[PDB]
Design an enzyme around this catalytic site. Sequence first.
Site, PDB file in Angstrom:
ATOM      1  CG  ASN A  34      -1.681  -1.290   1.460  1.00  0.00           C
ATOM      2  OD1 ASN A  34      -2.388  -1.575   0.300  1.00  0.00           O
ATOM      3  ND2 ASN A  34      -1.457  -2.026   2.395  1.00  0.00           N
TER       4      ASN A  34
ATOM      5  CB  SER B  30       0.761  -0.796   5.610  1.00  0.00           C
ATOM      6  OG  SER B  30      -0.361  -0.558   5.042  1.00  0.00           O
TER       7      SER B  30
ATOM      8  CG  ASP C  34      -3.000  -5.193   2.854  1.00  0.00           C
ATOM      9  OD1 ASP C  34      -3.121  -5.093   3.988  1.00  0.00           O
ATOM     10  OD2 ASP C  34      -3.547  -4.730   1.970  1.00  0.00           O
TER      11      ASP C  34
ATOM     12  CG  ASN D 150      -2.121  -3.369   7.110  1.00  0.00           C
ATOM     13  OD1 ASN D 150      -1.581  -2.303   8.107  1.00  0.00           O
ATOM     14  ND2 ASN D 150      -2.130  -2.790   5.789  1.00  0.00           N
TER      15      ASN D 150
END
Length: 130
Positions: free
Chosen positions: A46, A51, A53, A60
């Site tokens: 992201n 972050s 996933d 996350n």
Amino acid sequence: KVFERCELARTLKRLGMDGYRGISLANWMCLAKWESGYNTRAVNYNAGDRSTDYGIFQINSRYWCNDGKTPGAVNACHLSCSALLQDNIADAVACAKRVVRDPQGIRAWVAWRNRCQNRDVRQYVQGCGV
Ligand code: NA
């Protein structure tokens, strides 16, 4: 590993996911389908918040697992994010159970609200023998 629908359904039931914190097996199936396509090695960075996933449930790195490069992150599941990329989903399942123990429950995943909430999710488990 990319699970086949019924294979995953039977595995999740054996791992005690059916009805965990009030969440039906079909809802967990709907979540895995939309998050990763039942793929344990799925990884999505992201760019917006730095972050990532990880895994079949797209857990996350800011709150649940440690990958070392996510700013101000915690590791609530006490797992290296690498553990969520294994073919054996035992650790991913243990962490998913931890996520839903928080007030939001299954709503913690936006995809669940968009694609599963208030829908007929019976299709995800039909004919699997669970
Ligand atoms: Na983390």
